[model samples]
Target: KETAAAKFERQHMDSSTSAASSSNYCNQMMKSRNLTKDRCKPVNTFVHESLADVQAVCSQKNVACKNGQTNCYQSYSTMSITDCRETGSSKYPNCAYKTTQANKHIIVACEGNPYVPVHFDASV
Candidate 1:
């Protein structure tokens, strides 16, 4: 079983990608990363920064998550990231995505004694 922190890292972390490329970024990644195992993940964002840098976000600016959870933290800087949105015609096993990279502040949920990222809540 994977922890929420590990699951978030697997689905949203991309330490070496250079902002990614092509609209196929989401199309290919969603499947390869197993986010489309049952149904397409309607929306997801991948952070292109080191795990340590990402973990540090827990101590950034504490903020409310999208659904109003208080454990979420907002990034203090605009960071490189790729947003993957499922396309209208995207079907199961053929999930497609609209790939767009941007420099944006993000919001993440953190937990545990050290308070590291546990879930990707939103991009602020």
Candidate 2:
């Protein structure tokens, strides 16, 4: 079974990949990560920062979550991230995405005793 923290890492973290990625980055990555197999995700992002750095965000500035939750925090430091948006022409089972990269302060939801990231809220 996949825990919330683990699923967050699987869907959002990509510390090894560089910002100098190719145009086909999302298409390849999304498929490899099994995010585009049956149904296409509308939009998703991957952070190009260390896992430790991202985890530390749990203790950052307080912020409101999208789902009206209170356990969200905004990162103090700006980080590099890649946004993969599904193309208008993209359809189910054959998903295509457009890649947009930026440096932003992110917001995420944290839970559990250790206070780890569970959901990515937004980027500011």
Candidate 3:
């Protein structure tokens, strides 16, 4: 199985033409395996968490809460809280020192009128 990061890198980051090539490769692979491209299921991707929830979790863990000041980046709808520096001072950044292990897993909520819950472990 390919890691999500690996899959994203191969499909989008290798080169400018990677997206096109990845699409072709995927289609070919599916066909070779007797799979239907049209009927292929789409995987659920999600936001890491809303701003409020992130702050709440951080506080509960006794970690410094940077909240909206933090930078949360996403690719293919998979968001991650990448950076969280303390207010004013930058030398002792909290993001690097955060020890809270909870909420490390990515929580993916299903889309559409009736939402469903899904979870993906971030452990490598």
Candidate 4:
């Protein structure tokens, strides 16, 4: 099954929205995407790129994951992304987020026969 890949898409992919207008992008997206069901996700990111583009990163530069996994790859080109950090007073079911948008190269963990991103490692 492609559950891991699906989860990665659910959590990180947001090609449709422009973070410039929607300052509450995270607050709305996190909840609508069901990431705030149990508890507010402390931090998260949304990549503003096509699924194909992001998936292509799996074939880029090989890199070590945050946990030292060797299955990660860093994107050769920079991409637009938005960071969502939980607010100090945020609570579950009403998760609030502070959104920060930037352009950076992303690193992701890839796997499976088709070789797609399964985890967002970092951005730099």
Candidate 5:
């Protein structure tokens, strides 16, 4: 079974794609990254910073989480990221997405052992 830490990496980390410009990057990554197993993840962000850099955000700024929790943090500096958003035509088993690259201060929720990002809330 995959640990929460591993799942966090799979859903949010993509260091090699720090400057991804490929048009099909999201379509490929969303599936290859396993975010399309049950249904396409409507929106997701992959941080391209190092593991240590991303993890360190937990000590940055605290933000309100989507679920009203207070464990979220915002990056201190703009970081490279890829936002994958499913298209309106995205269908089960044939998911499609729009790949967008950006440099933004991301908001992510952190928790559990070692304190790492568990959910990507947004980028601003």
Candidate 6:
């Protein structure tokens, strides 16, 4: 049996696959559309955690991580808050919190086989 933390970690690990698959999809889309050379603008993605994690990983490859703050860039696109703290109260007491921080947009620059990726920091 896995503990709650373990389960969370497992879930986080599995979630990373979505971003990898999305990147692959983007690559295929670019190739099929023949827009590999031109600057392909970043688009908002649904895989928030996965995208963030992948950006962190990729940034670590080229840059360095410092004080829990990696040089990874975040997207400028806005998204609804998914995680919130629930106040212990009646139906009229609970409130949803909004974050000013925005999502990160990753730019996959298709160069060679694997491609050289770059990230834009749009974090609020």
Error of 5 at 87 (Å): 1.1
Query: For model 5, what is the error of residue 96's alpha carbon versus the real structure, in angstroms, after optimal superposition?
Result: 0.2
The best-first sequence of candidates by lDDT reads: 4, 2, 1, 5, 6, 3
Task: State the C-alpha lDDT per candidate.
Answer: 0.89, 0.90, 0.26, 0.91, 0.88, 0.30
lDDT of 1 by residue, 66-124 (tens): 89889999999988999999888988878888999999998999999777898998886
User: Model 5: which residue pairs collide?
Assistant: none
Q: After superposition, which runs of candidate 1 have C-alpha atoms over 4 Å from their true positions?
A: none
Off by over 4 Å in 4: 18-20
How well does model 2 score by local distance difference test?
A: 0.90
13-110: candidate 3 lDDT, tens digit per residue: 21222122322343333333322334432221122344333222222212111243222221233233221112232132111111111123332222
Q: Supply the global lDDT for candidate 6.
A: 0.30
List model 2 lDDT by residue over 1-124, tens digit each: 9999999998899988767288888888788878876799888889999999999999999988988899999999999999999998888888999989999999999999789999888999
- Residue pairs clashing, model 3: none
Query: Model 5: per-residue lDDT, tens digit, 1-124?
Result: 9977788899989887567769888898889999999987898888898989998988899999878999999989999998888898899899999989989998988888788887788899
Which of 1 and 6 is ahead in lDDT?
A: 1
Could you give the C-alpha RMSD of every candidate to the true structure, in order shown?
Answer: 1.0, 1.0, 18.1, 1.3, 1.2, 16.1
In model 3, what lDDT does residue 86 have?
A: 23
Highest lDDT, which number? 4
For candidate 2, give the lDDT of residue 107: 96
When 3 and 4 are scored with lDDT, the better candidate is 4
lDDT of 5 at 3: 78
